[PDB]
């Protein structure tokens, strides 16, 4: 379903593990009061 | 113990005695290189 890679940030320890892969869950919550047709499969289907 | 510690930490970072000031910490002198911090702490435990 998904496959992703991420680097982390400025650093000086090559073997230290980091949180770049957190980015796979990135999404924008500034405007979120009403549900989004794009997430609703019935809508997507109707459009197809 | 100040000559012995200065020399062991200086020789590990591969720098002359004047390059390493005694006022600075092991974490400071090492930068982010925690691989080298673990070696200095292992060497100080072996020594004293
Ligand atoms: P520093 O704070 O980066 O410490 C060096 C370390 C080698 C002891 C540390 O970074 C470490 O535990 N590295 C291995 C992390 C790990 O298991 N990542 C997955 C593949 S080994």
Structure description:
The structure is cut from a larger assembly and holds two copies of chain A (48 residues). Chain A is elongated. The two termini of chain A are 21 Å apart. Chain A is largely without helices or strands. Helices cover 15% and strands 0% of the residues of chain A. The first copy, chain A, is built from one helix and no strands. The A-B interface holds A 11-13, 15-16 and B 31-35. The structure holds 4'-phosphopantetheine.
Summary of the model, kept short:
The structure is cut from a larger assembly and holds 2 copies of chain A (48 residues). Chain A is low in regular secondary structure. Chain A has one helix at 41-47.
Q: Which molecules other than protein and nucleic acid are bound?
A: 4'-phosphopantetheine
Number of helices of chain A: 1
What amount of the residues of chain A lies in strands? Answer: under 5%
Q: What structural class do helix, strand and pairing data of chain A support?
A: little secondary structure
List the chains of the largest interface with their residue counts: A-B, 5 and 5 residues
Proportion in helices of chain A: 10-25%
**Strand count of chain A:** 0
Subunit structure (chain B): [Alpha(6)beta(6)] hexamers of two multifunctional subunits (alpha and beta).
Domain Carrier (chain B): 1-48
Family (chain B): Belongs to the thiolase-like superfamily. Fungal fatty acid synthetase subunit alpha family.
Protein name (chain B): Fatty acid synthase subunit alpha
